[PDB]
Amino acid sequence: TGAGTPSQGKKNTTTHTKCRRCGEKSYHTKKKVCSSCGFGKSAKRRDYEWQSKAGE
Amino acid sequence: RSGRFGARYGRVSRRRVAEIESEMNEDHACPNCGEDRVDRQGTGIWQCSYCDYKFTGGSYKPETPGGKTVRRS
Amino acid sequence: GRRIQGQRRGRGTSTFRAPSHRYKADLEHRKVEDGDVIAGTVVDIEHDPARSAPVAAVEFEDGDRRLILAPEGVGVGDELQVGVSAEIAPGNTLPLAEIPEGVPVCNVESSPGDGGKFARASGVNAQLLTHDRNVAVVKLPSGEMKRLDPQCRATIGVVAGGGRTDKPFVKAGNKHHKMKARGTKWPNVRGVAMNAVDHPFGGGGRQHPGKPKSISRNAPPGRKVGDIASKRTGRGG
RNA sequence: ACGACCGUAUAGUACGAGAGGAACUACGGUUGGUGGCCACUGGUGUACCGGUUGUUCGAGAGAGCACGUGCCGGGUAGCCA
RNA sequence: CGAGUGGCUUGCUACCUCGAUGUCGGUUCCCUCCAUCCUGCCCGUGCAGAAGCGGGCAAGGGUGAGGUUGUUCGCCUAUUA
RNA sequence: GUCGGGUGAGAACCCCGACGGCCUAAUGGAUAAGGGUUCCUCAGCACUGCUGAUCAGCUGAGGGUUAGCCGGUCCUAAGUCAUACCGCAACUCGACUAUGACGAAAUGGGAAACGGGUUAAUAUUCCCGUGCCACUAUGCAGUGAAAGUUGACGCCCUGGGGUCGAUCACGCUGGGCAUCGCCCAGUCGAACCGUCCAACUCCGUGGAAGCCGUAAUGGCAGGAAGCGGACGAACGGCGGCAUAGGGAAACGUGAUUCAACCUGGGGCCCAUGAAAAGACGAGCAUAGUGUCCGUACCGAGAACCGACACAGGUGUCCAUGGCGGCGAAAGCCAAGGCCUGUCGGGAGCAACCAACGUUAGGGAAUUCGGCAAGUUAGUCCCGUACCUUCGGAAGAAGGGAUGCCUGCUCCGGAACGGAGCAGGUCGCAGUGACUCGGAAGCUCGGACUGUCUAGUAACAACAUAGGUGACCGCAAAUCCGCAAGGACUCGUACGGUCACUGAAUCCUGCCCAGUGCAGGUAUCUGAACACCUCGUACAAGAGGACGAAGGACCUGUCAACGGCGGGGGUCUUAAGGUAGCGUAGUACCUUGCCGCAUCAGUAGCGGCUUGCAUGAAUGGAUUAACCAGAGCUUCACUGUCCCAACGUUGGGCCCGGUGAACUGUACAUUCCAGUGCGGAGUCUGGAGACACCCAGGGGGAAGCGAAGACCCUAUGGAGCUUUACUGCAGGCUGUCGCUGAGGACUCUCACUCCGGGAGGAGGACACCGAUAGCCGGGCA
RNA sequence: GUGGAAGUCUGUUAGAGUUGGUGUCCUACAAUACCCUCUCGUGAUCUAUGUGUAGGGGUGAAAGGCCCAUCGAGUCCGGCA
Ligand SMILES: [Cl-]
Ligand SMILES: [Cl-]
Ligand SMILES: [Cl-]
Ligand SMILES: [K+]
Ligand SMILES: [Mg+2]
Ligand SMILES: [Mg+2]
Ligand SMILES: [Mg+2]
Ligand SMILES: [Mg+2]
Ligand SMILES: [Mg+2]
Ligand SMILES: [Mg+2]
Ligand SMILES: [Mg+2]
Ligand SMILES: [Mg+2]
Ligand SMILES: [Mg+2]
Ligand SMILES: [Mg+2]
Ligand SMILES: [Mg+2]
Ligand SMILES: [Mg+2]
Ligand SMILES: [Mg+2]
Ligand SMILES: [Mg+2]
Ligand SMILES: [Mg+2]
Ligand SMILES: [Mg+2]
Ligand SMILES: [Mg+2]
Ligand SMILES: [Mg+2]
Ligand SMILES: [Mg+2]
Ligand SMILES: [Mg+2]
Ligand SMILES: [Mg+2]
Ligand SMILES: [Mg+2]
Ligand SMILES: [Mg+2]
Ligand SMILES: [Mg+2]
Ligand SMILES: [Mg+2]
Ligand SMILES: [Mg+2]
Ligand SMILES: [Mg+2]
Ligand SMILES: [Mg+2]
Ligand SMILES: [Mg+2]
Ligand SMILES: [Mg+2]
Ligand SMILES: [Mg+2]
Ligand SMILES: [Mg+2]
Ligand SMILES: [Mg+2]
Ligand SMILES: [Mg+2]
Ligand code: NA
Ligand code: NA
Ligand code: NA
Ligand code: NA
Ligand code: NA
Ligand code: NA
Ligand code: NA
Ligand code: NA
Ligand code: NA
Ligand code: NA
Ligand code: NA
Ligand code: NA
Ligand code: NA
Ligand code: NA
Ligand code: NA
Ligand code: NA
Ligand SMILES: [Sr+2]
Ligand SMILES: [Sr+2]
Ligand SMILES: [Sr+2]
Ligand SMILES: [Sr+2]
Ligand SMILES: [Sr+2]
Ligand SMILES: [Sr+2]
Ligand SMILES: [Sr+2]
Ligand SMILES: [Sr+2]
Ligand SMILES: [Sr+2]
Ligand SMILES: [Sr+2]
Ligand SMILES: [Sr+2]
Ligand SMILES: [Sr+2]
Ligand SMILES: [Sr+2]
Ligand SMILES: [Sr+2]
Ligand SMILES: [Sr+2]
Ligand SMILES: [Sr+2]
Ligand SMILES: [Sr+2]
Ligand SMILES: [Sr+2]
Ligand SMILES: [Sr+2]
Ligand SMILES: [Sr+2]
Ligand SMILES: [Sr+2]
Ligand SMILES: [Sr+2]
Ligand SMILES: [Sr+2]
Ligand SMILES: [Sr+2]
Ligand SMILES: [Sr+2]
Ligand SMILES: [Sr+2]
Ligand SMILES: [Sr+2]
Ligand SMILES: [Sr+2]
Ligand SMILES: [Sr+2]
Ligand SMILES: [Sr+2]
Ligand SMILES: [Sr+2]
Ligand SMILES: [Sr+2]
Ligand SMILES: [Sr+2]
Ligand SMILES: [Sr+2]
Ligand SMILES: [Sr+2]
Ligand SMILES: [Sr+2]
Ligand SMILES: [Sr+2]
Ligand SMILES: [Sr+2]
Ligand SMILES: [Sr+2]
Ligand SMILES: [Sr+2]
Ligand SMILES: [Sr+2]
Ligand SMILES: [Sr+2]
Ligand SMILES: [Sr+2]
Ligand SMILES: [Sr+2]
Ligand SMILES: [Sr+2]
Ligand SMILES: [Sr+2]
Ligand SMILES: [Sr+2]
Ligand SMILES: [Sr+2]
């Protein structure tokens, strides 16, 4: 069984969903953690300086 | 005996399974009454079909050499 | 390279844990106030998933229903005793002090009241040899002379299930079923059969440990494989 | 677009003590190659005719399906060696 | 011992190609060379004959089937002008 | 698909009918995930659709999902999170321990709903009929109430009860067919309420010393059979429900085999097959309440994932429709669905290609190799070798039979079950299609089933049982974490960790010098702190004494890394290759030599063997069984071949419509020679050459595709190794702090461990912080 | 005779897999597909959903295999021009 097309058919699991806090479809319904805003992980909002060029 | 094992495994492995299971299934004299009606129920567990005495013993025999020693001393 | 299998173990991931949620009970001796006024009746004999040996369910006078590490020869109906004044009969538990020298015991406590640590496997037994006011000398299954506080409790008799080791597994499938009842990763791939990145013995055209197998006690994890601090090897000499 | 060989007569002759043993020429055939043709023999022939298994159309009659014929036998034209 | 020709063997060189000209052997299909194995015509012989052996002209045609081995090569078998 | 017709401006593909077909574990029915309006209606055809389009999953506009009893909701599973506590420089980080919560929509547990009717689209939800559950209120009854039971459970074999379905017999209703007299359909009717009870268990009676019983095991004076009794089942029987409903009508009755469902008996485990909420226990009447969320549709060769209306991938149940047959097999056919695995028209339709049928004689000559194809085939009877671990080998091999029809026998309660007999009879052929093994021998490897390189490797590689060695007494060995802590472990030597070999059988020799590990160690060497000397009004510093682990040195150890040669009748460096096997999957020489077999055999097998360079758990030898493993031979068979032919289906070719991509410095009708950076359509010399187009097989454009995976170069990269360089974890060891009192000692009071607790064990040690020496490819 | 064991046999039952064709395809139906042959199919079996293990780390009956078409060290953004 190939890793390509044939294995794409088994994908019918729901993981990332609309997030209650930020509105993005990044709330992982299995981990109960938003990969976009950190909801479920931290009270503070997920943020990182590498999300932009260093001197900006 | 080890006939269910067909031509597989070799002599010893199934020679022992035979003797062991042969002595394992013989009718054993119940410690309670004296009837030879004890049968294994599982690993180290024996029961008499006559009086229903359920007790512990060897894994494949109701009594082991060391087990028979305790009585003495 | 990469951490060896022995190192993956310590992390205690599912692959390496024992099926605890399936285990029955902790066969520790009952805790008596004193006097030995504790007696129970063997209500049933059960299989113990964690030891491949039988265990007995006892109902004690005061109303406690607990599984017990059963010796050979215990059956339903039989009455068991646990206390300093318990009768010297197979299946009863009492401190070594109260035990007559030359009597096989099992589930021997390491430290008084711990519940039992030694001689708990199928068909084994410790052998109480010497008594005293300060030290009870017991000979354990490995044949070593152990000095114990005479206040350490034990059960008279040998453990049930003896001889379990006399019959060969014959099939890999049988080994398999037993291994699924333990905290062990099985089957076993030889170190020599792996790539150099995976084990000290891996690598090389043909298989062979490119080094002596006797490793130092001081070796770090990842390197301590093969024959650990062997005092000797082989069958000769 | 023809190449080569075998055989017969020449001749058991010439030659040679003998053993052995030619040629010119005239013939018959084989082989390899070449071009064409189907009266003959052979192949094919899901044109066609027949036999027959399972099943469906109630039986009978007559049919469908079972892969481009269910299977088997025979085989015209045509094409072929 | 001396003098040459070929470019089928091997070696040498590093001139062409590293933004790639796909290895060996075999197979299939086509053209060619002659230093000729057979076939045609000759000369010599230690050429009676038959046959050998050596040489000359000559490239029209032919040069096949098999056993081991991937083999090329080679060894082997029965045929063959 | 075809002929008619319908609608429309327009019809091969939108609809009707007929005829012809396709799908049967699916191409039918219900659904999970996922999608998200794709569902229904009307009006449309610019877009989407492999052609067209009046059609649609497309466009426009509206509409559609109704619940006490179907899910959710409730419970807890592996396990997750939150709070507290602790760690961490710190946190959104981290382990334990408490608490709380979360965690199952087909498919875990679980209070209660059936039948019919209705709509364009919902429907156990609405409507009609009938019924049921929980809670609460009122009334009567009731003092019981929590012990127990249930929820609640593995694998294999099997009896019994029993519904649906299917089939058989006869009747009734309707249909079909028309030489017969046959063939088809229907003949209905729930939940619920009530009632019946087989099995199991137990009691009374009885009194078996050999009887009772089973498919089988089994049972009994500790009381068998027989007799009577208590408890006790179905999603089952029976009655009601039902002058409910449904049907045009009839609106059956018995039987066999019996999925569901109920209830028993047996066997297996070095394997033991959830939990909790809840329920029962614990009556009845009447009334009231039963909110909240889901509900359409697709569920796939067009509604999901794969960029697509993708030949892929994707769970559940329909596993009992008919013939067939052992069958949930093939083949054919129903119910039901479809003609959308969606472009058509034309040419006896050429070459060539993909699938495939048939080939005379020869029969593996073909080829690296029988690759491909073929041969054999189902069932019954006869019969069956070497070898063997006594299981097997084995369907060995080899031989014979096989239909139909007429009348019968036997087994069984019987089957629309099975085994035979006699007579008759047809064909080339009776497992007639379909289904359906070719067989035998020798050798190598791995014992076996099992595993693997998703996407060029299925093997001899990995695993395995078996053998062996190593570590550790549990405050352990091994391992994870910076720490708090943790896996192993509800474990305790018959254990579990670390390694090697790889079933059985017969065996497993010699070597401890080097390296590794381990133990010992008079003497030697061996750091820091403290101490002493010199030096400094002090300090830096120099030296000394003491000396831990470690090393030197000694010993043990090869199923520890590994080794077992050359020379002469010992030497390096410990020993000097034993049993076995041997030209090997190891032998260069080598196609070794002899033999077998063949017309001929670098192959294969047997023997020899001085082995370039076999050899004993780096396991040796050997071996029945097994194998999509490597090699060899034989019988049978055949278009593999001699040597090709003819035929079939789909393409190819012509026509309508649709309609890309690769590639392109320029020029370009070339050929023969030469030249040129030595491999030119383009330079030179000749030759040839009127332009354009169709089909073709691919000689050339050193054809197109990819800034060569080879090779080298770069004071390039990475993965791996080690007695490379340099370091870092980690372990061992000494010292200082924790740390107390009286080169050997006692004590208790810190501290540690055990204990529910009292208390016990230990104890200034250990743990922890700091530093010093040794080891240190585990890591950078 | 009964019994019905087995990492037991046959088997396109469901279901799992993939020896050969070096067949078809190779701007594909498909960035791993199609057909025939072949292997397993009561167990170390297959399968759905839930759940856990995370990057020098997992997971690995070991092939440097697998960790979302990529693995002798994933992916994303940043260091970074
Ligand atoms: Cl084990
Ligand atoms: Cl639902
Ligand atoms: Cl029974
Ligand atoms: K090159
Ligand atoms: Mg315990
Ligand atoms: Mg496990
Ligand atoms: Mg192994
Ligand atoms: Mg490897
Ligand atoms: Mg390594
Ligand atoms: Mg050069
Ligand atoms: Mg090229
Ligand atoms: Mg010449
Ligand atoms: Mg002459
Ligand atoms: Mg010529
Ligand atoms: Mg319309
Ligand atoms: Mg509907
Ligand atoms: Mg389609
Ligand atoms: Mg023929
Ligand atoms: Mg040949
Ligand atoms: Mg073949
Ligand atoms: Mg009868
Ligand atoms: Mg060989
Ligand atoms: Mg194998
Ligand atoms: Mg592969
Ligand atoms: Mg394979
Ligand atoms: Mg082993
Ligand atoms: Mg072992
Ligand atoms: Mg090995
Ligand atoms: Mg192996
Ligand atoms: Mg040989
Ligand atoms: Mg040895
Ligand atoms: Mg080895
Ligand atoms: Mg380059
Ligand atoms: Mg290279
Ligand atoms: Mg590097
Ligand atoms: Mg503690
Ligand atoms: Mg390194
Ligand atoms: Mg899963
Ligand atoms: Na020359
Ligand atoms: Na010539
Ligand atoms: Na040859
Ligand atoms: Na009933
Ligand atoms: Na049937
Ligand atoms: Na169409
Ligand atoms: Na198998
Ligand atoms: Na040594
Ligand atoms: Na050796
Ligand atoms: Na196999
Ligand atoms: Na053919
Ligand atoms: Na060309
Ligand atoms: Na690398
Ligand atoms: Na028997
Ligand atoms: Na295959
Ligand atoms: Na990494
Ligand atoms: Sr696939
Ligand atoms: Sr899935
Ligand atoms: Sr969180
Ligand atoms: Sr931030
Ligand atoms: Sr414990
Ligand atoms: Sr405890
Ligand atoms: Sr190695
Ligand atoms: Sr030895
Ligand atoms: Sr003549
Ligand atoms: Sr003569
Ligand atoms: Sr047909
Ligand atoms: Sr046939
Ligand atoms: Sr180039
Ligand atoms: Sr010439
Ligand atoms: Sr000549
Ligand atoms: Sr050559
Ligand atoms: Sr040669
Ligand atoms: Sr139009
Ligand atoms: Sr529609
Ligand atoms: Sr919940
Ligand atoms: Sr459920
Ligand atoms: Sr099951
Ligand atoms: Sr029955
Ligand atoms: Sr619906
Ligand atoms: Sr459906
Ligand atoms: Sr599909
Ligand atoms: Sr139909
Ligand atoms: Sr269309
Ligand atoms: Sr014919
Ligand atoms: Sr051949
Ligand atoms: Sr041949
Ligand atoms: Sr036969
Ligand atoms: Sr695989
Ligand atoms: Sr493969
Ligand atoms: Sr062995
Ligand atoms: Sr040594
Ligand atoms: Sr020898
Ligand atoms: Sr072997
Ligand atoms: Sr010119
Ligand atoms: Sr062409
Ligand atoms: Sr099997
Ligand atoms: Sr291949
Ligand atoms: Sr084929
Ligand atoms: Sr491909
Ligand atoms: Sr099978
Ligand atoms: Sr079966
Ligand atoms: Sr991948
Ligand atoms: Sr950057």
CA angle C77/C105/B54 to nearest 5° reads 25
Structure tokens at C185: 């990763």
Instruction: Name the pairing type of β-strands C214-215 and B54-56.
Output: unpaired
The reported resolution of this PDB entry, expressed in Å, is: 2.2
Four-residue CA torsion sign, C168, C174, C177, C180: positive
| Those residues with Cβ within 8 angstroms of residue C190's Cβ, 6 or more apart along the chain or in another chain | C201, C207
Residues within 5 A (CB) of ion ligand 56: A 10, 12
Considering only residues 171-190 of chain C, list those whose CB is below 7 Å from strand F.
171-175, 177-178, 180-184, 186-190
Q: Does an H or E element contain B72, and which?
A: helix B65-72
Report the CATH number at residue A26. 2.20.25.30
3-state SS, residue C20: helix
Which domains occur in chain B, in start order?
1-73 (2.20.25.30)
Range of the domain at A15: 1-56
Element (H, E) at B16: helix B11-25
Q: How many domains does chain A have?
A: 1
Residue with tokens 């006399």: C166
| Cα dihedral across residues C198, C231, C138, C133: positive or negative | negative
Residues of B in contact with C72 (CB under 8 A): 44, 56-58, 63-64, 66-67, 70
Distance of CA C89 to the CA centre of its chain: 23
B29 CA – F230 C1', rounded, Å: 36
Give chain C's domains with CATH numbers.
1-78 (2.40.50.140), 82-159 (2.30.30.30), 160-237 (4.10.950.10)
Method for this entry:
X-ray
